[model samples]
Target chain A: QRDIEYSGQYSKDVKLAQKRHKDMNKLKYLMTLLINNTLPLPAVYKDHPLQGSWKGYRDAHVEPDWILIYKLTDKLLRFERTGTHAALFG
Target chain B: NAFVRARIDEDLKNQAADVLAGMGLTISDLVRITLTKVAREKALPFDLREPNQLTIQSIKNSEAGIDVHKAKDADDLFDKLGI
Candidate 1:
């Protein structure tokens, strides 16, 4: 079975999302897309760097502020991390 | 069976494996480590961020040899750019 992995920061972000019902739902939907291997890629992400020490990873929008970052491999998909744009990048 | 099966483009698999070999890891080892980390922490062990479009564009422009005047201060910058 396919599985979506989580980064250490992912749980905290989910907790934050729980405070906002809409955000929580959005996160769940995004996770579902990822697990199903049918996540849509935005044009911006096609060439965007993961922007850190981990070079191969990429992210998709979960909200205006929150993003779901991940990497794909031949074996399976990995959800490496997630956070608000600022917390994750800045 | 205690084995996993995966499919990858032949060329891609060779290229990636070449790189991994230099790091003393096989593709299988990398996958195993990722799974182990998730199993231990119940989460991924990294952070992710989207690239800021403006930031990315600026870097691209700079790399493409866009002319930019270096200045010591605001007045000097304006003077250099004739602004």
Candidate 2:
């Protein structure tokens, strides 16, 4: 879950959530590079889990209105994993 | 008759095996319950619902390990994990 400091500093709880989803590979984002008109989402979703260091994914940009195919279960009824995992920015 | 009835379909068998492995259930137990329901003409007992939960795909500095479990139908996974 994200701790939002509503009025103090502009918060980005959503961006952080987007970051986690991309890292886990469960929910992949559809993205395009500004320079090349190439679709990069498929390769970007390739699994690469290194013990020490992995190809960074936090920089990948995600469209706000992203579509995902997911399942429902009684146990996952929560705000944290349901919406977002955690946040790094305030 | 029990031996003959055990062979239903490959898909059903596989699914039963997977669910049993996940939940630690027995096919004989399920068969007995199903037979009783058939004799009484009632539906099997259970309620399944999807919670629309999204598993984490990316990770940030403060975020913990990425969640990899997505339920085709996994309520107990979340319950067991105490998430």
Candidate 3:
């Protein structure tokens, strides 16, 4: 389930989405920060899944092969890719 | 009725028994599944495209045709009927 779909080195935005084990905990913290005006709303869910899964529908946590139809929600941001790294190299 | 059973090596038979046990099916079920597979293969001609023929996007391309192409991780595979 956790295999490399594409080849590349990503910045923290990618790593935090894919490799970070404490992401769910971080989301709870961020949501609290957002509700309390401690963090900005636009920053939430900005990290893309192309970085990896375990975050949104695009990254490592996605239900493989489902991304072809489901456009991942980056409504929080202004960019998106089909997240077909596995389709390319796999 | 060509129901002849040939004797194979005892070692391979034991190994196959192990696999069958893990399959959780009785002999009848295994036989039924095997026959069904044979029937389907006749109909579909066993898309036995060689695994060696796999391109960079082989599975995805096939999946796209059959609506199974999407994958989350790179190595995701869905071997149908062990196809």
Candidate 4:
């Protein structure tokens, strides 16, 4: 799982995002960019660390509160969750 | 003359600066653009809430004190679990 390891919660959240009609392709594309290590958000992906969470997160403008959350290990890219402000924070 | 002071965490500020630079913007520079947009229109340029179900969504947070603050909500949740 060095390239991509999903937290149980992120797996669940990602599923819910699709259930909510979010574009799975867009989310996967964002991850593709991250997995490729070409970080710059491609103009619309406003990457933010958010408040106090460890995620070097990306603001997925794909939606108002949509966020692409992840963190880095020395050798791994750990996905945390995909959700809104209220969904993650408040 | 006047000034607008905006402060953010250093990493966040610099990261934003890096990403913004490619698009011909800066941390300070974007503030100007954002303010110019708001000044011309007199309001926020972005929406923090969802298009629908936001109240219902946020209302649940009160039980966990999400309305109290963002940090606490993240902290509370992250602390309870690992992230």
lDDT of 1 by residue, A28-51 (tens): 555556555664554433324366
Order the candidate numbers by lDDT, best to worst: 4, 1, 3, 2
Per-candidate TM-score, chain A: 0.70, 0.17, 0.21, 0.79
| Best-matching candidate per TM-score | 4
Model 2 reaches what TM-score against the true structure? 0.21
**What is the DockQ (computed on Cα atoms) for candidate 4?**
0.04
Runs in model 2 lying further than 4 Å from the true structure: A1-90, B1-6, B41-83
For residues A1-90, could you state the per-residue lDDT of candidate 2 as single tens digits?
Answer: 111111101013334444555442332222112112233335433212211222321222222222221211222211122231122110
Off by over 4 Å in 4: A53-61, B1-83
Tens digits of per-residue lDDT, candidate 4, B20-57, equal 99998867788888889877854334444432343233
**TM-scores of all models?**
0.43, 0.21, 0.23, 0.48
Tell me the tens digit of each residue's lDDT in model 3 across B1-83. 44536577999777777888897865456666777876764421121222122221333342244222222321231111010
DockQ of all candidate complexes: 0.04, 0.02, 0.02, 0.04
**Cα distance off (Å), candidate 2, residue B23:** 1.8
Ranking by TM-score: 4, 1, 3, 2
Comparing candidate 1 with candidate 3, which one achieves the higher TM-score? Answer: 1
Tell me the native contact fraction for each prediction.
0.08, 0.02, 0.02, 0.00
Instruction: State how far residue B69 of model 4 sits from its true place (Å).
Output: 31
